[PDB]
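During the second half of the funding period, the structural biology subgroup turned its attention to how the target accommodates small molecules. The most pressing case was manganese (II) ion, which had performed well in the primary screen but for which no bound structure existed. We therefore specified the complex as follows and requested a full 3D prediction, including the ligand pose.
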Amino acid sequence: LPALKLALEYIVPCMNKHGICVVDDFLGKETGQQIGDEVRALHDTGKFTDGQLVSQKSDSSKDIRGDKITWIEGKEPGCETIGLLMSSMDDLIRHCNGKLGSYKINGRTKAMVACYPGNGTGYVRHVDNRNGDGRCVTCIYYLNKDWDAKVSGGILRIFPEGKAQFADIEPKFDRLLFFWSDRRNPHEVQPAYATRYAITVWYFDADERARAKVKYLKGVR
Ligand SMILES: O=C(O)CNC(=O)c1nc(Cl)c2ccccc2c1O
Ligand SMILES: [Mn+2]
């Protein structure tokens, strides 16, 4: 399905109406599986961090750690299908530009690959960009085949501002998610009891990022 058709007929209207947009079967099984293989290779060769310190015990041997991460630019050896994913995300956003609210996206982060190791850890309720750091859209790609939250947990729960309900999103294989990064979409990852992988990039709004430089000071003489 052409990126422009997905953007104009689905991403743009859904984002402007709901601020949370799900696309299933984004790249297809072959490509999705190759991305999965690259992420697992990164994990198995020790490229992830040890995990977020969740419970700090008097005995450090009993510390509980949670989500592990690694930052991926997309050109590294063994990460080229991740890079292809990133380029595909960028193509979509490019075909949306000037139509995602009044934002003008002119950049993004590297990819943050996250692994919840399956030990009952999740991620506390938070806002991605709470203080105007420039990020306007969060984009997440999930890689977990036959994920069933009833058995493995790991639901992403979003609490859209001003609505007495939440939106639960299963981290399903080959699913792509967009949502506004700011305080409109507080969200959490519920405890995961199986290995759970996701790939995140954040897109920058030009004006917000330009003035973020001012309040987050870069020096000349
Ligand atoms: O994985 C998901 O479905 C949702 N994940 C997150 O919202 C999420 N957000 C942030 Cl800001 C971080 C930040 C650091 C590490 C992992 C994160 C994470 O999984
Ligand atoms: Mn988040």
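Two results from this model are relevant to the next phase. The radius of gyration is 18 Å. Residues 27 and 219 are 43 Å apart (CA to CA).
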